Protein backbone atom coordinates (compact mmCIF):
# COMPACT_ATOMS: atom_id res chain seq x y z
CA UNK A 1 0.00 0.00 0.00
CA UNK A 2 0.72 3.65 -0.03
CA UNK A 3 2.50 5.65 2.62
CA UNK A 4 2.55 9.25 3.71
CA UNK A 5 4.90 11.58 5.49
CA UNK A 6 3.33 14.63 7.08
CA UNK A 7 4.28 17.49 9.30
CA UNK A 8 1.84 19.54 11.35
CA UNK A 9 2.59 22.93 12.91
CA UNK A 10 0.38 24.98 15.17
CA UNK A 11 1.25 28.41 16.57
CA UNK A 12 -0.93 30.23 19.17
CA UNK A 13 -0.14 33.93 19.87
CA UNK A 14 0.11 34.92 23.61
CA UNK A 15 -1.17 38.49 23.83
CA UNK A 16 -0.12 39.53 27.31
CA UNK A 17 3.61 38.76 27.02
CA UNK A 18 6.21 36.81 25.11
CA UNK A 19 6.27 34.90 21.86
CA UNK A 20 3.72 32.42 20.48
CA UNK A 21 3.36 28.85 21.76
CA UNK A 22 4.45 26.61 18.93
CA UNK A 23 3.99 22.84 18.53
CA UNK A 24 5.27 20.67 15.60
CA UNK A 25 4.58 16.98 15.03
CA UNK A 26 5.91 14.65 12.39
CA UNK A 27 4.11 11.54 11.23
CA UNK A 28 4.79 8.57 9.05
CA UNK A 29 1.42 7.18 8.09
CA UNK A 30 -0.42 6.99 11.44
CA UNK A 31 2.84 6.92 13.53
CA UNK A 32 4.15 9.99 15.16
CA UNK A 33 7.95 10.01 14.99
CA UNK A 34 9.13 13.48 16.10
CA UNK A 35 8.04 16.60 17.80
CA UNK A 36 8.98 20.03 19.09
CA UNK A 37 7.20 22.06 21.64
CA UNK A 38 8.29 25.70 22.29
CA UNK A 39 7.37 25.43 25.98
CA UNK A 40 9.46 22.28 26.71
CA UNK A 41 12.93 22.54 28.40
CA UNK A 42 14.99 20.66 25.76
CA UNK A 43 14.38 23.19 22.96
CA UNK A 44 15.08 20.44 20.52
CA UNK A 45 13.33 18.30 18.06
CA UNK A 46 12.66 15.17 20.16
CA UNK A 47 12.13 11.47 18.99
CA UNK A 48 8.70 9.90 19.52
CA UNK A 49 9.27 6.56 17.84
CA UNK A 50 12.12 4.19 18.85
CA UNK A 51 13.31 3.72 15.24
CA UNK A 52 14.14 7.44 14.69
CA UNK A 53 16.59 7.18 17.66
CA UNK A 54 19.11 5.52 15.29
CA UNK A 55 19.62 8.89 13.53
CA UNK A 56 22.87 10.53 14.60
CA UNK A 57 23.32 13.85 16.41
CA UNK A 58 23.60 15.82 13.05
CA UNK A 59 20.07 14.80 12.21
CA UNK A 60 18.87 16.22 15.57
CA UNK A 61 20.97 19.43 15.15
CA UNK A 62 19.61 19.96 11.57
CA UNK A 63 15.97 19.22 12.54
CA UNK A 64 16.23 21.45 15.62
CA UNK A 65 17.71 24.36 13.64
CA UNK A 66 14.91 23.99 10.97
CA UNK A 67 12.01 23.67 13.30
CA UNK A 68 13.18 26.76 15.21
CA UNK A 69 13.26 28.76 11.88
CA UNK A 70 9.74 27.39 11.28
CA UNK A 71 8.40 28.81 14.61
CA UNK A 72 9.87 32.22 13.74
CA UNK A 73 8.15 32.19 10.34
CA UNK A 74 4.79 31.53 12.12
CA UNK A 75 5.61 34.17 14.74
CA UNK A 76 6.04 36.74 11.91
CA UNK A 77 2.84 35.46 10.24
CA UNK A 78 0.68 35.95 13.30
CA UNK A 79 1.74 39.62 13.30
CA UNK A 80 1.18 40.13 9.54
CA UNK A 81 -2.25 38.41 9.76
CA UNK A 82 -3.24 40.61 12.68
CA UNK A 83 -2.61 43.71 10.50
CA UNK A 84 -4.12 42.23 7.25
CA UNK A 85 -7.37 41.41 9.14
CA UNK A 86 -7.10 44.61 11.15
CA UNK A 87 -7.50 42.76 14.48
CA UNK A 88 -6.58 44.14 17.95
CA UNK A 89 -3.75 42.76 20.16
CA UNK A 90 -6.18 41.63 22.93
CA UNK A 91 -7.14 38.46 21.03
CA UNK A 92 -5.32 35.22 20.92
CA UNK A 93 -5.03 33.82 17.36
CA UNK A 94 -3.86 30.60 15.71
CA UNK A 95 -2.00 29.59 12.52
CA UNK A 96 -1.76 25.96 11.38
CA UNK A 97 0.32 24.52 8.56
CA UNK A 98 0.51 20.97 7.19
CA UNK A 99 2.77 19.65 4.60
CA UNK A 100 4.08 16.42 3.18
CA UNK A 101 4.14 13.70 0.45
CA UNK A 102 2.25 10.51 -0.32
CA UNK A 103 3.84 7.56 -2.15
CA UNK A 104 2.01 4.66 -3.81
CA UNK A 105 2.73 1.01 -3.22
CA UNK A 106 5.93 1.13 -5.30
CA UNK A 107 6.93 4.02 -2.93
CA UNK A 108 7.30 6.50 -5.91
CA UNK A 109 5.93 10.09 -5.70
CA UNK A 110 2.15 10.12 -5.88
CA UNK A 111 1.01 13.44 -4.38
CA UNK A 112 2.15 16.58 -2.48
CA UNK A 113 0.52 18.87 0.07
CA UNK A 114 1.12 22.23 1.70
CA UNK A 115 -1.75 23.93 3.41
CA UNK A 116 -2.11 26.93 5.71
CA UNK A 117 -4.98 28.06 7.89
CA UNK A 118 -5.65 31.11 10.12
CA UNK A 119 -8.03 30.98 12.97
CA UNK A 120 -9.17 27.53 11.91
CA UNK A 121 -10.10 28.52 8.31
CA UNK A 122 -8.31 28.00 5.02
CA UNK A 123 -5.94 30.72 4.05
CA UNK A 124 -3.64 29.37 1.34
CA UNK A 125 -2.85 25.96 -0.13
CA UNK A 126 -0.57 24.69 -2.83
CA UNK A 127 -2.69 23.16 -5.64
CA UNK A 128 -2.14 19.46 -6.49
CA UNK A 129 -0.02 20.27 -9.58
CA UNK A 130 2.41 21.99 -7.12
CA UNK A 131 2.92 25.10 -9.33
CA UNK A 132 0.06 27.39 -8.16
CA UNK A 133 -1.92 28.49 -5.17
CA UNK A 134 -5.48 28.56 -3.90
CA UNK A 135 -6.06 31.73 -1.92
CA UNK A 136 -9.32 31.86 0.15
CA UNK A 137 -9.65 35.63 0.47
CA UNK A 138 -7.94 38.92 -0.55
CA UNK A 139 -5.35 38.93 2.24
CA UNK A 140 -4.37 35.41 1.07
CA UNK A 141 -4.38 36.74 -2.55
CA UNK A 142 -1.69 39.22 -1.38
CA UNK A 143 0.42 36.40 0.03
CA UNK A 144 -0.10 34.44 -3.22
CA UNK A 145 1.26 37.38 -5.29
CA UNK A 146 4.36 37.54 -3.05
CA UNK A 147 5.08 33.80 -3.30
CA UNK A 148 4.58 33.73 -7.08
CA UNK A 149 7.11 36.63 -7.22
CA UNK A 150 9.70 34.91 -4.97
CA UNK A 151 9.28 31.47 -6.75
CA UNK A 152 8.18 29.70 -3.51
CA UNK A 153 5.95 27.00 -5.19
CA UNK A 154 9.01 25.71 -7.13
CA UNK A 155 11.11 25.29 -3.94
CA UNK A 156 8.31 23.39 -2.36
CA UNK A 157 8.04 21.18 -5.42
CA UNK A 158 11.73 20.30 -5.15
CA UNK A 159 11.19 19.47 -1.48
CA UNK A 160 7.87 17.52 -1.89
CA UNK A 161 8.91 15.51 -4.95
CA UNK A 162 12.55 14.98 -3.89
CA UNK A 163 13.67 15.35 -0.23
CA UNK A 164 10.34 14.34 1.36
CA UNK A 165 10.08 11.22 -0.79
CA UNK A 166 13.70 10.12 -0.19
CA UNK A 167 13.38 10.61 3.58
CA UNK A 168 10.05 8.77 3.70
CA UNK A 169 11.65 5.74 1.94
CA UNK A 170 14.53 5.79 4.33
CA UNK A 171 12.28 5.92 7.41
CA UNK A 172 10.08 2.99 6.05
CA UNK A 173 13.31 1.06 5.74
CA UNK A 174 14.56 1.95 9.29
CA UNK A 175 11.18 1.64 11.01
CA UNK A 176 10.57 -1.46 8.86
CA UNK A 177 9.47 -3.93 11.55
CA UNK A 178 6.61 -1.50 12.56
CA UNK A 179 5.94 0.84 9.61
CA UNK A 180 5.81 -1.91 6.90
CA UNK A 181 3.75 -4.24 9.14
CA UNK A 182 0.05 -4.06 8.97
CA UNK A 183 -2.00 -5.23 12.03
CA UNK A 184 -5.38 -6.57 11.00
CA UNK A 185 -8.19 -5.86 13.51
CA UNK A 186 -9.18 -8.31 16.23
CA UNK A 187 -12.98 -8.34 15.90
CA UNK A 188 -15.84 -9.45 18.15
CA UNK A 189 -19.55 -8.72 18.71
CA UNK A 190 -21.47 -7.86 21.87
CA UNK A 191 -25.16 -8.01 22.72
CA UNK A 192 -27.06 -5.71 25.29
CA UNK A 193 -30.77 -5.84 26.03
CA UNK A 194 -32.19 -2.29 25.71
CA UNK A 195 -35.68 -3.34 26.89
CA UNK A 196 -37.63 -6.63 26.66
CA UNK A 197 -38.17 -6.16 22.87
CA UNK A 198 -35.23 -4.14 21.44
CA UNK A 199 -31.58 -5.44 21.47
CA UNK A 200 -28.23 -3.82 20.47
CA UNK A 201 -25.45 -5.57 18.56
CA UNK A 202 -22.06 -3.88 18.67
CA UNK A 203 -19.25 -4.91 16.34
CA UNK A 204 -15.71 -4.19 17.57
CA UNK A 205 -12.51 -3.63 15.73
CA UNK A 206 -9.56 -3.46 18.14
CA UNK A 207 -5.85 -3.26 17.88
CA UNK A 208 -5.45 -2.34 14.17
CA UNK A 209 -2.97 -0.44 12.12
CA UNK A 210 -3.24 1.68 10.02
CA UNK A 211 -6.25 3.66 11.10
CA UNK A 212 -8.31 3.54 7.90
CA UNK A 213 -11.09 0.96 8.39
CA UNK A 214 -14.72 0.39 7.31
CA UNK A 215 -17.48 -1.18 9.41
CA UNK A 216 -20.83 -1.89 7.72
CA UNK A 217 -23.94 -3.51 9.02
CA UNK A 218 -26.11 -5.64 6.80
CA UNK A 219 -29.50 -7.15 7.18
CA UNK A 220 -30.39 -10.24 5.08
CA UNK A 221 -27.54 -9.23 2.70
CA UNK A 222 -28.36 -5.47 2.29
CA UNK A 223 -26.65 -2.40 3.72
CA UNK A 224 -28.31 -0.84 6.73
CA UNK A 225 -27.63 2.69 7.96
CA UNK A 226 -30.85 3.25 9.85
CA UNK A 227 -30.80 2.40 13.57
CA UNK A 228 -26.95 2.25 13.55
CA UNK A 229 -24.25 4.32 15.15
CA UNK A 230 -20.51 4.51 14.25
CA UNK A 231 -17.85 6.04 16.54
CA UNK A 232 -14.93 7.96 15.16
CA UNK A 233 -11.85 5.79 14.99
CA UNK A 234 -9.83 6.33 18.19
CA UNK A 235 -6.17 5.71 19.16
CA UNK A 236 -5.60 2.95 21.83
CA UNK A 237 -2.42 4.63 23.01
CA UNK A 238 0.02 1.81 22.05
CA UNK A 239 0.29 2.73 18.31
CA UNK A 240 -2.96 0.89 17.30
CA UNK A 241 -6.55 1.89 16.81
CA UNK A 242 -10.11 1.05 17.78
CA UNK A 243 -13.60 1.56 16.37
CA UNK A 244 -16.99 0.08 16.74
CA UNK A 245 -20.37 0.19 15.06
CA UNK A 246 -23.66 -0.89 16.49
CA UNK A 247 -27.23 -1.54 15.39
CA UNK A 248 -30.50 -1.76 17.24
CA UNK A 249 -32.60 -4.81 16.28
CA UNK A 250 -35.75 -6.48 17.38
CA UNK A 251 -35.25 -9.26 19.96
CA UNK A 252 -35.05 -12.68 18.38
CA UNK A 253 -33.89 -11.26 15.02
CA UNK A 254 -30.15 -11.04 15.73
CA UNK A 255 -29.10 -13.55 13.04
CA UNK A 256 -30.46 -11.52 10.19
CA UNK A 257 -27.61 -9.08 10.92
CA UNK A 258 -24.01 -9.26 9.82
CA UNK A 259 -21.12 -6.83 10.39
CA UNK A 260 -18.59 -6.44 7.65
CA UNK A 261 -15.04 -5.29 8.31
CA UNK A 262 -12.64 -4.02 5.70
CA UNK A 263 -9.01 -3.24 6.37
CA UNK A 264 -5.75 -3.23 4.41
CA UNK A 265 -4.42 -6.06 6.61
CA UNK A 266 -7.30 -8.48 5.87
CA UNK A 267 -6.66 -10.37 2.57
CA UNK A 268 -10.45 -10.60 2.20
CA UNK A 269 -13.21 -8.71 4.14
CA UNK A 270 -14.46 -10.28 7.35
CA UNK A 271 -17.99 -11.05 8.27
CA UNK A 272 -19.35 -11.30 11.84
CA UNK A 273 -22.67 -12.76 12.91
CA UNK A 274 -24.06 -12.92 16.44
CA UNK A 275 -25.20 -16.57 16.41
CA UNK A 276 -22.61 -18.92 17.91
Amino acid sequence: GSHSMRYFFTSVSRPGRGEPRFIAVGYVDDTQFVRFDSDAASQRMEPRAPWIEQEGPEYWDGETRKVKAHSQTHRVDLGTLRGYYNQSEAGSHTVQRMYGCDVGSDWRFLRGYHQYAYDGKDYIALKEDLRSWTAADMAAQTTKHKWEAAHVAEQLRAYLEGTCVEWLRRYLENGKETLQRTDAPKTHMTHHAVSDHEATLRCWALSFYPAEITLTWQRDGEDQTQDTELVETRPAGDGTFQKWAAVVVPSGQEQRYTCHVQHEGLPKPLTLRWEP
Partner: peptide
Protein backbone atom coordinates in the same frame (compact mmCIF):
# COMPACT_ATOMS: atom_id res chain seq x y z
CA UNK B 1 12.96 15.66 7.44
CA UNK B 2 11.59 19.21 7.50
CA UNK B 3 11.67 21.68 4.54
CA UNK B 4 14.86 23.73 4.51
CA UNK B 5 13.19 27.19 4.42
CA UNK B 6 9.74 28.42 5.12
CA UNK B 7 8.86 31.87 3.73
CA UNK B 8 6.85 34.37 5.63
CA UNK B 9 3.40 35.14 4.34
Amino acid sequence: ILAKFLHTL
